[PDB]
């Protein structure tokens, strides 16, 4: 139309060009590296200065004019095969996928430069983050057997309904709970299905009792991500990292989405509820980021709390955008850039946590703290406090700019 | 289109089954579901009508944006020039007669629509700037209060001392318990404090109690009349939207003056520092008020909590600026689960900026008066206020409270 | 075209008028000064009026609509070419400087009043303010001799590149790095070669050794504003106050803007290091205004940070926007309406200071903390954060109003 897409195209060409003909990524001389990465570079710049204008456009074909929902992992899809070069495909993502972290081209990093323009779009933006809002497939498809049996076990999840509870026990027994792209997708199954279920009225999350040597018999919250996986390439930018931070991390603050399906949809299309945290030994990495979002957090006087996502070389999640809130600037940059440690009984440890209780008297205290948040007060208020704490505007853009940094980080030396 | 001939038929349905149907509290299961299904369908209509329409609507009562109505004439005007969209003078008269659980629920269609109008980035902020224009009763007042220094009201009195506008909530028999009356009375009493060029700072304090439980002692504010709301005397318009967008609101941002002044270019709003000094407790719209101060005072054994949340009620505007006070762990400890903090306590200090023993209360409340003069702590409090609280923030804060609030007001939990 | 561009040349025609035949400023009468005044007051109502409608057009004739980037200083200049009257011309500033700030007409006010439009604007104002995060033409030109040498020599900043670090010395011995328009000048260039310069990892601000001799030996951050300079009329709104904060404070925040140059512009066009703080002595007000946009804080275990501005009479830059941020909205208004004064030693110093270390242990804790923040990480996590804390648009709109409120404090009586 005006030249970009064209431009695009052929800069992708000499993309594809170049990969055809020279080596394999570990026998490139020095001329050829500086060849390929130029040529990365100049596809890339083009693909943000396409969507800068062309977002919208974009976005529009492939949700008719934003009247379908897609979700992420949908979305990056169709618009690969519908613009060509744009982002890749199925395919070599599934060649990526075979390679190590380090020999990978970056194509995941295309995927960045597309979710961060069409969240930047004020119409495109805020339709996409509704579509993960929803609920999954998946637990639509589990959600009777749920309601007839108040269990439903899953890899990385154990969810049960007691007394109007759901509680969602991590129970990765071998690694210490390690996050990985399959933990998403059962976290995010157990939440759906909390918030649809009317005998929930509460959500507890709590890590199960360890069965890796150094913790066996003990509770562990969440040692984080995966890092081997990280190392080996199997951590996803779209299927993991966007995907727990746009959907389960989102409905936990908002609700689901549903459908004009009941009375009063037209003052609450989301069906959101309170949920209470319990750290049992410690909550590293994208479990302590999970912290920042519960309505009640309880802790045993052993525990700690760290973001050692930094030197690691990625970013925490949305921790860069709510830890300010909980502990003001000077200690979310000694957290975040510099890595400390916050012990549970130490005076800092209640910005981020409301009980500190010793081993023998927390299971009773959990208990206790899951009969306080029970009625529609409770949702109404805690509804005006996220709004106030985190404006939809203020998440938006965060989670704009983090797609593209943390796919940067994602492929940078560190 | 339709939209309006839609919502048109669904009132129609509404007033055909109240006129037909028993009255509340004797009819049949399958009578209140019937009822409570086509309120349902008005509602949902008034919500997309308003979703479209509520640019022209507010234009066609406010001509274009060119005259500030306030939210009691603006609903007055909404209801005759679009009948069905909100109740009427009258309805509302048959409203307040019942007890809360009886009600039809009329007020929420008032919150539908003021909730459309804050929404719109071109309505919203006019409403807002409506609001903050000076009431006709201070405005009636003003030469009197200049000539007299004093104003006596019904749960308020006020009084000009070395330039200092003394405001003494004074319902001694009930703990300053908020109703439609006090903020009437505030909203003037700021009105005056804030026009009067003789005053260069503001102070709120309980008086006096006469009560038997605290005969001769100050009590700040009890909150909300919960007899009165349980007998339906608490109105959504006059009561729970006026405090939060007259009064309370001008005393972050001050009174929208007319263009008769000079400087008025650079400071179109007259606003002055105030503080404030709690005797015996701050509790609910009490404690509420004291996020909104310059400088807050308050003797050592004075709690603050906002049980609204108990109640079955939203804090007022307290969701929106707790969190910048004390965090969002603490203000979910606050208006989640009641928790009272203690003047004493550490974390008072983030409600709280001096707490003192009684007897030496009066003169440390006097001291700081004379700390907040000079045109620089104007300057400075303004800036402050604009990087605390974002005109958009507070307008899309109250723009949802107006119909979550409205929900709560006619909840089951409630009408207990 | 509307009225409002001729009604200002009439009105700023009356000014010149009434300064041409009044007397000068000490000796006319009393309604000699209420005429002038009221003849200021609507030229600069008009000033206000013109540009809420025209700003984005005269911002696009001074811009060639937004394609060439002016720093401040070049803007108000070409504004007062091609639209006389809006903005006082170099003429009529270099008048008012040869004054003491008491007999000056307030003609700075004009260019605050032009300053908060232009921010005001969604596009204008951005695009001014990616013209001041560019690099000085000065930091260009001697960036070619600080690569070589890795050393510059300036009046109130010693530039030293050291293992990775730019090491920005304040070194105004005779006066405790009391702030004026050299020191701003000195201080951006110093910024604008530290990023530029790709041996630089990490930057590092201090104060060196004083040599006053209440003083003599001993390091000191900073005394803040030059509170003489400001009585004899020279602080410059545009070149010290606006300045400071579009320029190098603004960088330390967000980094320098380049050309499209280098691999990696399409997602990172401006080059932003993590920065050091050190705090010898005390930081006072615009010295602990910096203190707010550092990666790491450390401090002498004797040292004290205040902002006494207010008690001067004028607003401590940014620290209105930044501060309730770091320690909430009691002790912001405590520090900066009150003029509460913060040791190092106490426990809110903590909401400040990251480490606060004896005399015989700083050196080394800053060497220690300069090793800590090296790496791409580091740099995306704070990129991440400060997005997160101070957006765009909230410091844009801020640094707005502030151009025409700190305007009128420079000029108000308390202040002179
Ligand atoms: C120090 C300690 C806490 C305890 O040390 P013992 O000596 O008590 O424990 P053993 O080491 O014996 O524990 C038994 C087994 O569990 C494995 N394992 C542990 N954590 C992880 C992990 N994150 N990823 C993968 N494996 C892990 C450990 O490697 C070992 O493997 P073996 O059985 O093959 O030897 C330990 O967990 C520790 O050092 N943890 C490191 C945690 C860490 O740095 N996490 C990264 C934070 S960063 C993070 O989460 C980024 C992030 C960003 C996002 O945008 C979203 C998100 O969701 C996450
Ligand atoms: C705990 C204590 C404060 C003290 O306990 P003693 O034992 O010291 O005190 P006695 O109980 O003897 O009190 C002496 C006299 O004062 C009367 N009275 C007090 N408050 C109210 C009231 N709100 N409405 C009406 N009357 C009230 C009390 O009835 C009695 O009069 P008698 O003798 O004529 O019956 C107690 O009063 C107490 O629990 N009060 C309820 C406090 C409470 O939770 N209020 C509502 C919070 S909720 C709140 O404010 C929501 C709110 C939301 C908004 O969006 C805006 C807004 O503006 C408000
Ligand atoms: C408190 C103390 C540090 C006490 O220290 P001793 O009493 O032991 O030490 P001596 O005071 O003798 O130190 C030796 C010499 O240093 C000179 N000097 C010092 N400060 C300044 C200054 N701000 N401006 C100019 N000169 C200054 C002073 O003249 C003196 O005498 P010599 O002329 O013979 O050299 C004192 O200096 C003190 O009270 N300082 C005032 C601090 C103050 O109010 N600062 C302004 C706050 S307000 C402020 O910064 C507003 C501001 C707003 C903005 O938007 C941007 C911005 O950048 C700033």
């Not at 018999?217 to 190392?231: E, P, T």
């Not at 959101?272 to 945290?277: C, F, G, N, R, S």
């Not at 106030?388 to 943390?406: H, I, T, V």
Request: aromatic fraction near 6%; proline fraction near 5%; hydrophobic fraction near 45%.
């Amino acid at each position: 139309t005006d030249g970009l897409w064209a431009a695009l195209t052929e800069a992708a060409a000499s993309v594809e060009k170049l990969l055809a003909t020279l080596p394999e990524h570990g026998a490139r001389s020095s001329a050829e590296r500086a060849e390929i990465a130029a040529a990365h570079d100049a596809a890339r710049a083009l693909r943000v200065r396409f969507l800068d204008t062309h977002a919208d456009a974009v976005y529009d074909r492939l949700t008719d004019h934003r009247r379908v929902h897609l979700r992420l992992a949908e979305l990056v899809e169709a618009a690969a095969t519908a613009f060509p070069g744009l982002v890749p495909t199925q395919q070599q993502l599934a060649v990526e996928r075979s390679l190590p972290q380090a020999a990978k081209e970056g194509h995941e990093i295309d995927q960045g430069i597309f979710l961060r323009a069409v969240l930047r779009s004020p119409l495109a933006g805020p339709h996409l983050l509704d579509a993960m809002l929803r609920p999954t497939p998946r637990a639509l498809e589990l959600l009777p057997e749920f309601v007839r049996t108040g269990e439903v076990e899953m890899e990385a999840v154990h969810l049960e309904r007691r007394d109007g509870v759901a509680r969602l026990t991590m129970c990765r027994d071998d690694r210490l709970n390690a996050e990985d792209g399959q933990q998403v997708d059962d976290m995010e199954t157990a939440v759906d299905l909390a918030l649809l279920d009317p005998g929930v009225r509460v959500g507890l999350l709590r890590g199960g009792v360890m069965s890796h040597p150094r913790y066996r018999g003990k509770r562990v919250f969440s040692a984080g991500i995966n890092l081997k996986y990280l190392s080996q390439g199997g951590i996803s930018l779209v299927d993991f990292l966007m995907r727990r931070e746009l959907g389960y991390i989102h409905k936990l603050v908002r609700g689901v989405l549903t459908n004009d399906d009941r009375p009063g949809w037209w003052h609450s299309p989301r069906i959101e509820k309170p949920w209470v945290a319990a750290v049992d030994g410690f909550a590293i990495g994208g479990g302590a980021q999970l912290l920042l979002v519960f309505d009640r957090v309880l802790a045993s006087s052993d525990a700690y709390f760290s973001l050692p996502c930094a030197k690691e070389g990625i970013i925490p999640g949305a921790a860069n955008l709510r830890l300010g809130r909980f502990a003001g600037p000077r200690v979310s940059r000694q957290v975040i850039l510099e890595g400390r440690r916050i012990w549970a009984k130490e005076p800092e440890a209640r910005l981020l946590v409301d009980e500190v209780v010793e081993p023998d008297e927390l299971d009773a205290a959990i208990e206790r703290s899951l009969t306080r948040l029970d009625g529609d007060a409770v949702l109404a208020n805690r509804r005006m406090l996220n709004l106030a704490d985190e404006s939809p505007d203020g998440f938006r853009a965060y989670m704009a700019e983090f797609a593209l940094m943390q796919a940067l980080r994602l492929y940078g030396h560190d």
